[PDB]
Design a protein around this nucleic acid. Sequence first.
RNA 1: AAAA
RNA 2: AAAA
RNA 3: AAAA
RNA 4: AAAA
RNA 5: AAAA
Lengths: 249, 249, 249, 249, 249, 249, 249
Amino acid sequence: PQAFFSHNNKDKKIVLEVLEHLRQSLVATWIDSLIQQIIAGISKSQYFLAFLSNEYLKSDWCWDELEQAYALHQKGKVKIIPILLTNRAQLDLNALTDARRNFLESILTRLKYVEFDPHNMTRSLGSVAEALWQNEAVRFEPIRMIKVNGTELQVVEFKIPGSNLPVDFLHHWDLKIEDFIATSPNEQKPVKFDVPVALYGPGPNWLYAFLTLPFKNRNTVFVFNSRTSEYICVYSKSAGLAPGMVLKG
Amino acid sequence: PQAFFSHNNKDKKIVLEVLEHLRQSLVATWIDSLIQQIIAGISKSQYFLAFLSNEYLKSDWCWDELEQAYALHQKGKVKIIPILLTNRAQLDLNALTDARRNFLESILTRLKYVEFDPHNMTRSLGSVAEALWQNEAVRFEPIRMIKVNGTELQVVEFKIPGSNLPVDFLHHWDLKIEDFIATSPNEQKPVKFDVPVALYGPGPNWLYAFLTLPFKNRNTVFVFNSRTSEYICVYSKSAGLAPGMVLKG
Amino acid sequence: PQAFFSHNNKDKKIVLEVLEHLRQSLVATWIDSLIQQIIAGISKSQYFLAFLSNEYLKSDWCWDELEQAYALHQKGKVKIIPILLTNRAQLDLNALTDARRNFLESILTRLKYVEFDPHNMTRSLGSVAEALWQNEAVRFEPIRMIKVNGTELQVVEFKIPGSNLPVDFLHHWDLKIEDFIATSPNEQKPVKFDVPVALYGPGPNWLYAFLTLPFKNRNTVFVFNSRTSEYICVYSKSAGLAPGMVLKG
Amino acid sequence: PQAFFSHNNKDKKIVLEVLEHLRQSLVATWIDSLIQQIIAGISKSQYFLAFLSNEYLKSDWCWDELEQAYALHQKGKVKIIPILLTNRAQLDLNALTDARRNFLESILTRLKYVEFDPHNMTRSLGSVAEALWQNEAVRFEPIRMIKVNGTELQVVEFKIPGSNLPVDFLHHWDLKIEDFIATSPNEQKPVKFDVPVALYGPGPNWLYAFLTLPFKNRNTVFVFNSRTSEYICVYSKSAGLAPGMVLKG
Amino acid sequence: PQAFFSHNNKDKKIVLEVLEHLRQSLVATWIDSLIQQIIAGISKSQYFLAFLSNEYLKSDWCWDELEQAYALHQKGKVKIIPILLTNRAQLDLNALTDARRNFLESILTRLKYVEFDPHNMTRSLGSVAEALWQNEAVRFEPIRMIKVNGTELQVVEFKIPGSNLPVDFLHHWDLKIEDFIATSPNEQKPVKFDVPVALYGPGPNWLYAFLTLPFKNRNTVFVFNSRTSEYICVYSKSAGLAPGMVLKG
Amino acid sequence: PQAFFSHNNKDKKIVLEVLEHLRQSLVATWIDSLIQQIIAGISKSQYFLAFLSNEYLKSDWCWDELEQAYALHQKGKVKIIPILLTNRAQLDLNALTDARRNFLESILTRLKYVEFDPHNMTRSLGSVAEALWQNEAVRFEPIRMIKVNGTELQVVEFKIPGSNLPVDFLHHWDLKIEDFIATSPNEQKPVKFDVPVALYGPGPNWLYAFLTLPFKNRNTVFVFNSRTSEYICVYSKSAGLAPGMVLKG
Amino acid sequence: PQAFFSHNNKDKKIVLEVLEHLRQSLVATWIDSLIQQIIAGISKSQYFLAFLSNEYLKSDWCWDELEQAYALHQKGKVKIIPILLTNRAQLDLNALTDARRNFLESILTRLKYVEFDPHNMTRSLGSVAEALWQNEAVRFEPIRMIKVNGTELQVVEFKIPGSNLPVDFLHHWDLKIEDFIATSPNEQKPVKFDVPVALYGPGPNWLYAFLTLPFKNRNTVFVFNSRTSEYICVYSKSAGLAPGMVLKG
RNA sequence: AAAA
RNA sequence: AAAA
RNA sequence: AAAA
RNA sequence: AAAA
RNA sequence: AAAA
């Protein structure tokens, strides 16, 4: 799923680490218009991340985007997730005009908002991630760079809400993965360059085949089997790795 | 009230934000002598801001000015507010001569000093302002650049010690306000050019009359009435503003 | 507020004295058409003074002016205050036509009239003034040339019926105090030229701010503080009058 | 309570001194229409005063005013009290028409009247106040200029008929003290300007607080305590009047 | 009443809440010389707050302050209360010299101290209040905000030691309330800005009048009557409320 | 503004003295066609002074000039001010035919006329100027021969009706000073040759600069400042007249 | 004001650019004797710009010039402003003779001097102008060329120290504008030839007048009015403009 | 009239 | 065979 | 009239 | 009329 | 064959 970030200029510091955190969660991002890019791809387009803040509301340029963002939000192409950088109590509602105020208090109630606090980032980041995935198909936890039995790998863990997926789910998905693979060691990407990749999480056989398949000629692939709770190598794109060696988890 | 700033050029990096914050507090400053300018105006001349530091006391010129400043301070013409850039414990007291040392500790104990800390910026500047307003009449908080109900205005805050003021207090005041009004947008002044000016805080009616009058032909003036706790416009020097419109606060 | 005077040339001896007393009461006066001047300004345009007299009812030009005034009075844009030059008993009703008698009786009975007698100037002038402010907001009193502490002053006394005013009340006031200030000693104006002006009577802070603000560069202003019950100087334009003098009252 | 005075110009000498007497009893008095002023305020609007006299009944304009007042008085919105300038025996009933005589005879019997005699001013004035206050709430007394211990005070003495009030009495109490205070020494008001006021009469604590509160910045306030039967200064406005002095009254 | 705080900066963290709790008790607080500030106002000047701590007893600068504080306490100008941050058993009495030691034990026995602890903070806070209010007049329990019947309000609790007060008690009271009313919502003070205030507690009528009177144009005032036990509105400064409503307990 | 005079030779003795008075008011005059001179310059070209006189009604050549002037007035190019040499009652309307008697009554009733009596010469001149400046912008008063402090000075006084001017006013102001100045002492002009001039009357600074500017190398200029109310010399042209002298007018 | 320059020929590179900026601030300079030129004009002769440098102290012909300037400075004809080309710390005081050295340490201490350094042109040039007008009347900021709405324009910005000027201040003023007007584009002058000049900065009307007259037949004049904050044209010396358009800021 |  |  |  |  |  791709995402759009609308935020005020005073908050570069508090945006990218949210921006980056979503990137390691394999969520496509585009920071910098945003309105015409809404009409792109599938009906499951994207979620508007309105980084609501006191100084954000004093920018009319920021306000008009949120106006058009909600204007086509009702028609169903997008749902807006407004993250309050500050607590709802001390949002300065008096400065806005009555039309602006009534428009703000509308969406804040009938549509669920997420509060953000820089002091406790861990629960703050998770709240946005949970809000992002709340109305979604199979989840995607951030990539963990872990070490097992002396070898290094990055694990891609995905959680399936409920138990079953639609049989034709892959037709409507929008998470082609090959653009998340780093091409150079210095390049920052969710998947490190030439680092072994492991898939974790229970799921159907077609889901697993759909994920490792684009990894050919890119990275060694590891698969986790619950029968013995271990990782299994399927692709050997680097020396010292054989297809089928086992790592004890 | 005017203020004279005595300092050495090594601590230049910190003095401007001290006086810049002080200038928004409707406090006149005079950095660049200071001795002969003491004898000017009313017996409520000024306060001597001696920015005491280890390198400050190492300069013979920086010492003699304080000597004369204290010499006529005993006559009561001026009071000195000592600012310690470095905490008193690590002050290089040994480098001074015995006559120099005995003089320095004399003012330090019998006269209250203000401890300064670059890290705790907000509280430290408040303490300096507090000492300035400690022995003064009605206070003057720094100008807050606020916007309320779609219109942007600069507010003026004043706090009165006790409950009452002398009837002839305006006779002995030295705070003419036409020297704090900006003439051009680029040059800095406590009162921004053409920006609506607001008066807040309880006070006598004659105090209000003395303040709004010099703003004629300069800026739109706003007054706060506690009966409805809202703002009232008295002067309309700009388009789109009518005398008597009410701002919700 | 402005006022339109309807009178016959034999009553010219008395209208100007009424006009002057109304002028000294800070009421704008318009003597010399009047019909099209009615539709100008806001809904609180003026109050029509019908100086009813025996000869006034004998003029065809004077009759039709009243009729159109009443025609617009029904609309509520203007109202007519009938001032009786002679007593109602001795009014020449027989000479008038049947329509004129009925029209005169309709306005004299359904709308309260004012009885005027040359013998009692003080009460008659006050009743004329009282009828002007009965349905009006905060009251104005004639300017008084009063000398206190050996210093000459003029007073602008305003009385508030009900001790409460609308918050946006000034938005609907029709009076520019500048036009009442004389630009020359020979000019006839409610406020004399270079004579200090004093404000008296209870009122909100914003009313005091609005009233004395246009006085800048025109006259020195004084206000009343009921806490100590004496006048205080707030403006220094004349020689020897610093801002802050206190004059007992 | 408000009061509307209906009288003939022959009794003009007597009504104002009756009007002035009721004014000192903190009764709002309106002399100068009267019909459309009935529809204003609360159900306890006012008490119509019919100054019945031989000449008064001889005027058609005055007669129809009483007819309208009684006609809507049967609705209970207002009550009329007849004050007889002449005694009932010598009233000119024969001059009245049969409908007028029956109408006057109807009201004079079913509704209680008050007799007025010029020689007995002291008794007659008390009866007028008693009739207004026989069917009314907490009663006041006319203001007395008394001097205790060399201090001038104006006692506002009040009485409670029954020593029991509704707990929400102040909700419908249409008595605003602000309008009864003098803004100038020459102003005719029940409360004189700058003269300290004194509260007398047993009652609930909150009743006092409602009365003294508007006096802030207006007059020095005194309150009577029955524990020592002595007065207490609670406001310090005039010179030398500290809040807390004791007067043996 | 006023209070002066002398302490060491390692105890600066814990002192403020005691001061902040004390401020809520409508008790004037002065933290930051002090020795010359003792001679001010009436003989009931303040109470000295000696926060005795093991760190405190090692400061020569802090010790000598206690000397003149105790010295003029013998004259009866001020009475000192010692607050022991640590329990008396573990005070480092061995560090002090003999002369300093005999000084400290002397003031500990003949003068009542208070025992303090940070675990049982509530009782510890109450004990300090009791010591201050033991020798004082009618008490003042800290302001509490209670939402009764859907309207927010604050209660000013006052309790009278014994049963009565001197008739001239108001003269020497140093508790003018205006020093405790906030002017802005953000700035902290015992009385919140624009919040309705209520007076609850038995007392004489003049005491009630003296309290609500300074609140005009500041906050809405409520008075408690024990006859039926609700709050009675006397002042109406906020929209939606009128003087006369009742708040059932 | 321009002025075109239409009159008969019988009133030539009085026409030029009215023209001279209007010339002294800085009004441009053209005496001796006029019909084709109407279409010249700007829309606010001039005002037709129709000197209505009985003999003028007997000269058909004068009649036809009025006919087109009315016709061109109807489109708004010019406005006619009819001046009555004789009063309305004695006007010879009977000798005029039906078409002409209907012609004049339309102007006399629908358009305001000016009454002129040679006896009240001063009032007549004022009414002529008053009508001329009634529909105009800032007015120009007659220039007086005033001596102050031993200096001969010609003062130019103006008055702003309403004390407000369009900001772009100078673009459409058809008032050039250069043609009102005298080249030789014997030449008749509103401005005397080589006599120093002054500016008086409140107004914007750009208005003052515009009026004095054409005086370079022409006359010595003075200005009036209301701060001290003394004339200020700004031009050093005549001998002994330095720029900067103070003239106590 | 006037200006005399004292410098050494090695520092020719810097002085003329200091002169160039000072000339742009409308100060006439005289670089190339100087001693006899002091007795010329008024008591406010000029400010002696002593460009102190290491080599300047090494020229005997340059030194005695300073002594005569200083010696006559005691008479108050001129005040000397010393500019330090190099810092005071490494000034070659040892090379100078005892009399010469003592003369230098005299002037350097009792009169304020100016430090100048290459690396910062802007502060160095501003500080020179700052001390240039520290003891002088209304300041004249350097001429700046600003094109507004497509119209090229040069602005002369002047600011008044304090709030008021002496009424006869123009008598002693030494800023004859005609000496700063260019006659040809090629030559350099503070005012560009044929380029319109705009007047900016609050001030009295007469001061505004004093500057515009010397511009007639020379350059187009513009005046900034703060009522609406644009520039108003009063003189038309160039085609395409006639006095009166508005240049919105 | 010291929560009337 | 889209870095085999 | 000391945020009426 | 001291940026009206 | 939905971590076989």
